[PDB]
Every structure is written in structure tokens, then in C-alpha cells.
């Protein structure tokens, strides 16, 4: 999945 | 207009340095090209007259060598040195290499320097007489060492020092503070190390200083106050620590602060709080704590706010949608442990914006709120609300909407057919989630949609038809992604996609997929579904990744599918297939789990 950070 | 002799001499030399003849110079002794250097590309001249030279003789001199974008190779010739009237040196972007002639640091009447983007390398010569330079640019080069410790001993009219993407080491160098006119220092992307000397707070007309990925240390001194004219400052990728000073009434002209991946801690200072002219701020990845607080009176400047990957508690600040300016957000990894404030649905300048693994609770309420914001074309909701409903209140719109992700929240309920008033979705991810039901036909109407990743989740029933006839998939700003990580940095970095991995789909490959000829991934891995291979998935031309491991598929692997030219992973595994294999060079991992 994508996520940011 | 008539080359001065001595002149050709060392241009001639600075030919011999070469690997191949510049087009349009005289590079041998056969008269095809002039043999006036003044008439040659890259070569401009001026009378010795105009250059205050009395020599009864007159002669135009070599006063601009600009040779960007040459593919010139080989070294740079100690003869160079000997051009005595040359004002610029302009080799950027060129293949050269070999290391630097001390001798090119004497050059009496030198304004610029730019050797930028070659491969030189060595030590860089210790002692630099350059009493006209304005400009030294060596960024992106092979040079080590120290950065000469009397660098500034003769630079007095320097404006900008350009040392960066090169592999100086050791401390900033003392005597860095004496170069008291320059404007620009960039030392980023180097080996330095150790604490910032307090001498370089000394130089006041430092406009930009970029510091950016090196192993400096120490703490950020509440000198930084001095340098009052700085507009760019960027401290990223070091070893900084303790607090951030509380000096930034005093930088009045900085518009970009980016301090992240350091060790900061404590609270952001009030006066980075009251800042009228800063513009981007990235403090992520730091320790930073507290209750986040920005006064948007005060910060009218605001456009970009990264306080990401910190240790900050405390509520969501409720003013945000004040800061007028202020376009995107990027919140991920603060817990808050709270719910999106009303005032939200009020924040009509908020383009983009990351809550992801931030602890927000309340899906339902998030989502009602966030709709109103009109200009939001990314949200990024992943890692929240978990094991929550997913709403389907019809009343939802997203209109400019083209990412959302909203993953690994474990979301019950199903696809909300009121996504279908996003019709400008480019990225949709609901991967890892515990959503059901079908997927929705519409889907397929989304005329801009590449990137669709409904993996782990419950889905059931039929792949809809419509997804052969995705448009986007049929046809042909900073905020950054990572995939769960590789970075991506922006939506279009992304392969157009079709993920339906690890649920419970049935039927069979709709032959019309072959339409799919922009589609790079298509993953079906792990789900029920049956029939044959279409032969038609040959048709998919830009193809790269195919997994139909894990499924009930029969028949023959159709040869047409050698028609693939870009195909780089293929998996049958563990279905039940028979027959040939037209391709002998996918591992047995790939083909294994059929009989046949
Ligand atoms: C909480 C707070 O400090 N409020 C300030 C106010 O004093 C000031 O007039 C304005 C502009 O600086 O920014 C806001
Ligand atoms: C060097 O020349 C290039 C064009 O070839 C230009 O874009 C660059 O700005 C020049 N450098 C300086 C310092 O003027
Ligand atoms: C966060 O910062 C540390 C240094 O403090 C760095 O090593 C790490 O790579 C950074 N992580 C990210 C994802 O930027
Ligand atoms: C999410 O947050 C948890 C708790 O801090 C952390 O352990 C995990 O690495 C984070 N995951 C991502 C993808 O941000
Ligand atoms: C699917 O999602 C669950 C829940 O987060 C996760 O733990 C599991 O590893 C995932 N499985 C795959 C194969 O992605």
C-alpha cells in the first residue's frame, strides 16, 4: 500500500 | 576582433587537453576553419584597448570561454591558465575530468568559475588567488579533502560558493567565515562533518546556505540570528540536535526552512510559529514535540507545511484553515489520537493532504468534513480509523479529487458509489482494508484512473467488464509517496496498475483486458477465478508485470503472449493448467502447482 511519511 | 597570439597558444593547449576537436576551432595546422579565435564558438573577445592593456600592438583578448553542454572530454588543460585577460570560464555539463591546476585559481581577472557538472577530482588546490571572482561553481563533481582551510584568504568579491554533490570532508573550514560578500554558500550533498563553526554565522549577506545531507553535528546556535538577509536555508539529512532557536523574528527575509531527518527536539519555536515571510517549512523525521501550534495571522506567507514523522501530541490545530495560503500538509506519523476539526470543511486553500498512521478516529466525520474542501485533489488517510466503516452516505463529494488513498485502516462495509463523484480520479488505493461485497462496474467510467489497488480486501463476485475499458489504461509540486518503502514523488511516478490481489473474485479473464495496451501491472493473484487465458492478453502492449498465481485457471497458456515485449514477471503458480509452454526463462517458481 502507499502511505507518506 | 583580431586574436591575440599568445592567446591562441593556450587555447591551443587547452585543445590538447581534450579527447575530441571542438567544431568549428582550428584543431590542426590545415586551414578550413578561421584562425582567429575570436571567431570560434564558445569564444567571446574584446579589444586589449577596452581591457586598459597599452600595448602599441593592438589585439582583440580572450575574455569568455563558454563551452556548456560540449561533451568535451578529457582534462582541463594547464594552459587554460595561461588565457591572462579571461573574465569567465563556462565548462558546465561537459565529461571532463581529471583534477584542477592550481594555476586556474591564479587567474588574476577571473568573474566566474563553472566547472558544475563534469567529473573532476583530487584534492581541491589549497591555496586560490581569484581577486575578481564572483562565482565559483564546481556542484556535482568528483573533488575530495578538505575544503581549503584558506579558501577566502583571496576571494574578496565573492557572491556565491557552489561546493555541492561533490566529496569534500572534515569540518566547515574557520576561515569560511571571511568570505564576508558571499551571498550563496552551498556545501550540500558532501562527506563534512562535526559542528557548524561559529564563524559562519559571521557572514551577513548570506542569502542562501544549503547544508543539506552531510554528517554535521552539534546544535543549531542561536547565532543563526545573524545572518539576517538569509531567504533559503536548508539543514536536511544531518546529525543536528537539542532545539530549534528561537531566532526567526530576526530572519524576516526567510521564505524555506527545511531542517528534516535531524534529531531535533522540543517544541517549535513561537517565533518560527509568528514567521511572516516563510513559505516551506519540512520539519519531519525529526523528535519535535508538543501541541502543534501556528498562529495563521501571523504566517500569511504559509504555502507548505511538513511537520511529518514526529513526536508531537496534543489535537489537530483548529486555526489551519487560516493560514490562506497554506496548500498542503503532510501530518503522517503524529499520533494525535483525535478526529479531524469542523473547521476543516473551512480550509478552501488545501490541496494536498496526509494524515497517514496518525491515529485519527472517525472515518465518517473525516470524510463529511473534508468533502467541502474544493481544491483537495490528494488525501492521504492510510493507517487510521481502524477496523471503522467505511460510509456510504450518499451525500459525499470529492469533486476535484485525483488521489486517494486510504489504506490499511482494516475498513468494513463496501466500494461507496459516491467515489463516483470523484470522475477526475487519477490513484485510488483501499488495499488492506476488510471491504466486501462486488466491485463496483463504475469504476471502469473513471475516464483518468491508472492506479487502482483494491488488494487485501473481501471483494467477491465478478471483475467488472468495465475495468477493460478504462480510458486512462486504453489510451495515453512536492509531497512525496512511499510504497509499503520506495519512494515515489508524485501520482504519474506510479506504473498504471490494476491490483485485485488477495480476495475472493470469480469468473473468468474478460478477453477485453487485451484493450489495456497502457496498463504496466495487472495482479490477480490469490482470488477464485476460473475459465482460460485469454489469448487476447497478448494484446496488452506495454505490459510488464502479469500474476494470475493462486487461482482456479485452466487450459492452455496461450503462445500469443509472446506477442509481450515489455513482459518482466509472469506467475501461473498453483492453478490447474495443462499442456505446452510456448518464455524459458521465467523460473520454475512461476509455472509450478500445475500438472500439466
Ligand atoms: C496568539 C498571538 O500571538 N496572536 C498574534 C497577534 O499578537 C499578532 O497581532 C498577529 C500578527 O503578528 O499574529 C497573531
Ligand atoms: C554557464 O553557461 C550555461 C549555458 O551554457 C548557463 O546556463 C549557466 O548559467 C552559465 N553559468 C553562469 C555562472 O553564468
Ligand atoms: C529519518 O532520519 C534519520 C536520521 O535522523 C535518517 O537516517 C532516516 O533515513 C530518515 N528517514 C526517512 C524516511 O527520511
Ligand atoms: C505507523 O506507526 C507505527 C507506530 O509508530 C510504526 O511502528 C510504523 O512503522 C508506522 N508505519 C508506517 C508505514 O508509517
Ligand atoms: C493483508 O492485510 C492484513 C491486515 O493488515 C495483513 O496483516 C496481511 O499481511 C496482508 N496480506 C497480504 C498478502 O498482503
Aim: hydrophobic share 35%; charged share 15%; with cysteine.
Amino acid at each position: 500500500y502507499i502511505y507518506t511519511q | 576582433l583580431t586574436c591575440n597570439s599568445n592567446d591562441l597558444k593556450a587555447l591551443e593547449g587547452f585543445m590538447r587537453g581534450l579527447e575530441s576537436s571542438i567544431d568549428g576551432w582550428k584543431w590542426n595546422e590545415s586551414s578550413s576553419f578561421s584562425s582567429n579565435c575570436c571567431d570560434w564558438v564558445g569564444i567571446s573577445c574584446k579589444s586589449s584597448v577596452s581591457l586598459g592593456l597599452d600595448d602599441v600592438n593592438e589585439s582583440g583578448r580572450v575574455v569568455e570561454l563558454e563551452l556548456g553542454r560540449r561533451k568535451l572530454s578529457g582534462k582541463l588543460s594547464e594552459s587554460v591558465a595561461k588565457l591572462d585577460q579571461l573574465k569567465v570560464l563556462n565548462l558546465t555539463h561537459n565529461s571532463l575530468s581529471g583534477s584542477i591546476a592550481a594555476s586556474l585559481l591564479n587567474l588574476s581577472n577571473l568573474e566566474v568559475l563553472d566547472l558544475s557538472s563534469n567529473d573532476f577530482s583530487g584534492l581541491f588546490p589549497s591555496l586560490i588567488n581569484l581577486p575578481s571572482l564572483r562565482v565559483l561553481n564546481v556542484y556535482e563533481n568528483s573533488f575530495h579533502g578538505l575544503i581549503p582551510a584558506s579558501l577566502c584568504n583571496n576571494l574578496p568579491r565573492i557572491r556565491e560558493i557552489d561546493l555541492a554533490m561533490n566529496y569534500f570532508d572534515g569540518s566547515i573550514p574557520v576561515g569560511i567565515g571571511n568570505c564576508s560578500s558571499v551571498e550563496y554558500l552551498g556545501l550540500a550533498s558532501n562527506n563534512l562533518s562535526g559542528s557548524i563553526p561559529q564563524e559562519l554565522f559571521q557572514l551577513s549577506n548570506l542569502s542562501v546556505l544549503a547544508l543539506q545531507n552531510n554528517r554535521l553535528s552539534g546544535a543549531l546556535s542561536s547565532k543563526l540570528g545573524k545572518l539576517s538577509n538569509l531567504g533559503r536555508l536548508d539543514i536536511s539529512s544531518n546529525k543536528f540536535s537539542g532545539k530549534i532557536p528561537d531566532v526567526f523574528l530576526e530572519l524576516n527575509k526567510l521564505w524555506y526552512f527545511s531542517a528534516q531527518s535531524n534529531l531535533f527536539n522540543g517544541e517549535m519555536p513561537r517565533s518560527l510559529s509568528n514567521s511572516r515571510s516563510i513559505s516551506l517549512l519540512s520539519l519531519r523525521n525529526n523528535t519535535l514535540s508538543g501541541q502543534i501550534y501556528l498562529n495563521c495571522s501571523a504566517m500569511t506567507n504559509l504555502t507548505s507545511l511538513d511537520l511529518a514523522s514526529n513526536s508531537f501530541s496534543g489535537s489537530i490545530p483548529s486555526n489551519l484553515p487560516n493560514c490562506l495560503r497554506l496548500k498542503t500538509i503532510n501530518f503522517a506519523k503524529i499520533k494525535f489520537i483525535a478526529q479531524i476539526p469542523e473547521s476543516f470543511k473551512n480550509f478552501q486553500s488545501l490541496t494536498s493532504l496526509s494524515f497517514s498512521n496518525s491515529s485519527i478516529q472517525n472515518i465518517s466525520s473525516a470524510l463529511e468534513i473534508l468533502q467541502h474542501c474544493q481544491n483537495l485533489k490528494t488525501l492521504v488517510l492510510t493507517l487510521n480509523f481502524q477496523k471503522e466503516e467505511l460510509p456510504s452516505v450518499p451525500s459525499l463529494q470529492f469533486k476535484n479529487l485525483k488521489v486517494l488513498i486510504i489504506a490499511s485502516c482494516q475498513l468494513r462495509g463496501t466500494v461507496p458509489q459516491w467515489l463516483s463523484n470523484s470522475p477526475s480520479l487519477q490513484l485510488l488505493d483501499l488495499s488492506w482494508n476488510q471491504l466486501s461485497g462486488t466491485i463496483p462496474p463504475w469504476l471502469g467510467s473513471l475516464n483518468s484512473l491508472f492506479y487502482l489497488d483494491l488488494s487485501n480486501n473481501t471483494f467477491i463476485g465478478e471483475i467488472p467488464h468495465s475495468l477493460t475499458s478504462l480510458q486512462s489504461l486504453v489510451s495515453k509540486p512536492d509531497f512525496p509517496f512511499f510504497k509499503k518503502g520506495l519512494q515515489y514523488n508524485q501520482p504519474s511516478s506510479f506504473p498504471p496498475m490494476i491490483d485485485l490481489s488477495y480476495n475472493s473474485l470469480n469468473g473468468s479473464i474478460w478477453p477485453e483486458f487485451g484493450d489495456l495496451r497502457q496498463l504496466h501491472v495487472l495482479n490477480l493473484k490469490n482470488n477464485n477465478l476460473s475459465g482460460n487465458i485469454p489469448a487476447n492478453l497478448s494484446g496488452m502492449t506495454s505490459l510488464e508485470v502479469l500474476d494470475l498465481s493462486h487461482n482456479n485457471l485452466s487450459g492452455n497458456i496461450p503462445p500469443s503472449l509472446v506477442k509481450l515485449s515489455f513482459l518482466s514477471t509472469f506467475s501461473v503458480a498453483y492453478n490447474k493448467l495443462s499442456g505446452p509452454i510456448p518464455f524459458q526463462t521465467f523460473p520454475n517458481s512461476s509455472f509450478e502447482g500445475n500438472q500439466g
